[PDB]
Nucleic acid binder design. Structure first.
Lengths: 135, 156
RNA sequence: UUAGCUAGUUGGUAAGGUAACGGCUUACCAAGGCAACGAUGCAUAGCCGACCUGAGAGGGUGAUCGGCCACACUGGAACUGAGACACGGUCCAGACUCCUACGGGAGGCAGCAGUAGGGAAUCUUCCGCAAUGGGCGAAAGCCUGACGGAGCAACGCCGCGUG
RNA sequence: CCUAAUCAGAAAGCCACGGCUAACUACGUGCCAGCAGCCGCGGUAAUACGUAGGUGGCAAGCGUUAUCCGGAAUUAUUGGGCGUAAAGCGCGCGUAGGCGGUUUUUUAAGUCUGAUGUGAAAGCCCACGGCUCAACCGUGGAGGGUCAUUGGAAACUGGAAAACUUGAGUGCAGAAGAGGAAAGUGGAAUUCCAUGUGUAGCGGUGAAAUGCGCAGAGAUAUGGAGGAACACCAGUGGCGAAGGCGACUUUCUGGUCUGUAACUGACGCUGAUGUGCGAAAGCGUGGGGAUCAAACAGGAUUAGAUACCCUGGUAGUCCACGCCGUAAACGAUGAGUGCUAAGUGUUAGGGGGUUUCCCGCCCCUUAGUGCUGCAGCUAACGCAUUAAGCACUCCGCCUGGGGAGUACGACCGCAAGGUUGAAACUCAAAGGAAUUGACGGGGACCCGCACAAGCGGUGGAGCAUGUGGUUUAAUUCGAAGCAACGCGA
RNA sequence: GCCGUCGAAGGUGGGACAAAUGAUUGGGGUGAAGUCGUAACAAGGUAGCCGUAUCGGAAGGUGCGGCUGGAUCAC
């Protein structure tokens, strides 16, 4: 652009929006004040659990669940991983993740530390999967 | 069409209750430019375990694997919903006396009518919930005649 | 997808008023005065020094720490005193909440720990004034949740090995 | 913190190994489980699941996640475009403003060019001291203003003054026109219709239905009407800034250029806001309606039929102004500036010589509009004196796709609704150019017992084997259009 | 001690944004079935832009205007 119009303008960038609406507790539990908390985790419950079916050929049956965290904001979220012992209205920790299974969702639960218990039979959960070192 | 999906409802309601002996309260399908999303709310017991969703989804998918009068393949959404329910009837409120509900009533507060409380007892139109708003405790009798919208709520 | 704002306002006149200043406020007369070079309105925000990434340019950030500003249940005040309309004065009223012989009395951690809750959780309901830092004096001393110190969170670096 | 001793003896792991990036094989596993940051893997055989080993990387930590920048130059001042992937209003006039021609001085405003005060401290960089060292504080230095002041300076910009000129101006001579808008004139003729003749059908189709129509439709020839846009030219002619602008003419103007240098003396510059002008439709109103024409219906079609094929007609198209202001207004090439091989035209000019008008030629440029092409540059495409090459003041856009020009506001709009203008969701693409395949059919070249022309084989009837089947105590395989059946055999 | 300046706070009334709600209406789709609608030929089919309108429920088409556009695609 010309120098003058460059001056009378900011040349604004194309700054993005976080595709993860991770508005953590912030001021939810006083004044219900919306607050952009970037917490990597909030405690909260999946009030309902479900299971959408994938199409062929990989009929890798993926299971979903609708959850409320500390802010209690509705979202249908899929469960990854093998093995669990939770049910309806069980408290669950959900991490940010978008996978190839189904649109309309951009988060994912984590295994091991809460009602959706992981499995300690593998060795990949040695530092993760919520489960301790397989000893 | 709707007649077609009803026909699938009757044909696949057999499995659901010979498989997991569940009942589908309904099967409804939403679509956004692809195999539509037939949400079948499967019932049986209220607190359906995720496995009780995985196995039931296996059953229903295999049932329709060879059964699909509808020419295209589509997403089966196998839903085992919880107790959360819209309270239109008084019995809907009576069952929910255990769990909290939120209602929208002709007399709001601060512009909007929606308020959540946790039921202590059932009292016809009158409400003895431990309604908790702004961290405030009280049993407030919300008149159902005021109630324009009412739904059973999450227990959290 | 914020364009008109605008009447003590504009300026002066006289009074007062304050350290001063003036609509600063009164009474006067006069109509101003701002408004795209974005006032106004809205959201939002403590400020900067500083800091993070970036070769840098830059971008972003604004933990303690330096200072500056704002606030001290809420509003309205005002006494005091050099200085407060007073973070731990007061008055009143509003609540709020608490309690009373029910007649009215009582309180306000955005001080420090900690409590409850909230939160993913954040450190002693720790000590001391040893060190300084005051207040008050001449001083001892008073208090010091400043601060110093240890105390927890492999929370962060750095550093020893885990031969 | 240090010393007497204590052993290798307490003390360490974790991540990854398809690659991306360091490291793999064996195994169980079975497109399933699954893994999954990306390509995608896993279908039984996985270095992509799990296990064992083995390796790597790393460690008092490791890995995941949340965010900021690097990346990300993904703002593109540095460090993007708009020739096409995203972008030039539709095109204007112009306010401010942006930048500012040649020369002569002053200014010192800037500018430069030092001095001053003054940039808390720390951090900040450097050096250095301490803490084993590191970490670390400290120490000083450096750094740190776009601050104010003064020393010069006058190149430059900005002033101040002085003028010069071609730009600009305007000056004279011409050349120059679908430019604009008003008005009038004509024409062939949509359509309708007058009259006269004239049938029997017109009619659209698959049939037609319909619809028209035997009292004259369709048709004819004589006659008009209305309204319509104007048969050629027509072209890269032209005007324009575009919209758009072509029947003729005029209106009273706007613009075009050759030459011109006429001479004040930069008077110039694009141009936020503003803002005019402006396809079509639509529409308000008031007329027309000549077509045309949605809707429409008669009506094929078919319960349905407007679906379309009909027949007629139809808002409006058309006249008055507004609303309309929008579009493919597209070159998605803002404008102006001036530079830069060529060949090589145009549209107007001019000149020189050339010759009778050189008009004839040539050549020089004037100012545009070509085609090929130097260089240049583009992913490519191509432009290339008219750059998409080179540069310069001034405008707007673009920020993946799309979500959605759409929401929504506001304003406006008679309205239509417009203008205006998203969020959320979602996907790793979307996209551009090119680059290789294929399609997909006739004619024509054309050959072949492919035919013509004949000629040879099958079954006719019966028999040998075979192909197949039957049944069997078994009736043995293996194969079958061309490319099976005395095939192996 | 009274009055008078101001005076919170607080409420009253006129309205504005209003906020969810929403009177009832409207729009739609819908035949389970209550109308009963028949039961013949089932479609003679079509297809290079944008804006704008008039319908088509739409699917599109009549369009008006002027035309830039960038065949198929594989392992």
């Amino acid at each position: 652009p010309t120098i003058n119009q460059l001056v009378r303008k900011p040349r604004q960038s194309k700054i993005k929006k976080s595709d993860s609406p991770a508005l953590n507790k912030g001021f939810n539990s006083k004044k219900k004040k919306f607050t952009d908390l970037n917490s990597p985790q909030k405690r909260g419950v999946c009030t309902r659990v479900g299971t959408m079916t994938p199409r062929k050929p990989n009929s890798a049956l993926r299971k979903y669940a609708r959850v409320r965290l500390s802010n209690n904001i509705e979202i249908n979220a899929y469960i990854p991983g093998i093995g669990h012992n939770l049910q309806e209205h069980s408290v669950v920790l959900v991490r940010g993740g978008r996978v190839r299974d189904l649109p309309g969702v951009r988060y994912h639960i984590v295994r091991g530390a809460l009602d959706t218990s992981g499995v300690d039979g593998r060795r990949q959960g040695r530092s993760l999967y919520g489960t301790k070192k397989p000893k | 069409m709707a007649s077609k999906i009803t026909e699938q409802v009757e044909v696949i309601v057999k499995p659901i209750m010979e498989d997991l002996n569940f009942e589908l309260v309904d099967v409804e399908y939403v679509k956004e430019g692809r195999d539509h999303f037939l949400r079948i709310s499967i019932d049986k017991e209220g607190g359906v375990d995720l496995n009780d969703c995985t196995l039931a989804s296996e059953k229903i998918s295999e049932a329709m694997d060879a059964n699909d009068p509808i020419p295209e393949m589509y997403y089966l959404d196998v839903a085992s919903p919880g107790a959360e329910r819209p309270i239109k009837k008084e019995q809907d409120f009576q069952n929910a006396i255990t769990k909290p509900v939120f209602v929208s009533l002709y007399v709001p507060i601060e512009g909007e009518k929606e308020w959540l409380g946790i039921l202590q007892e059932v009292n016809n139109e009158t409400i003895v919930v431990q309604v908790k708003i702004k961290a405030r405790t009280k049993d407030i009798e919300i008149p159902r005649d005021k109630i324009a919208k009412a739904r059973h709520a999450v227990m959290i």
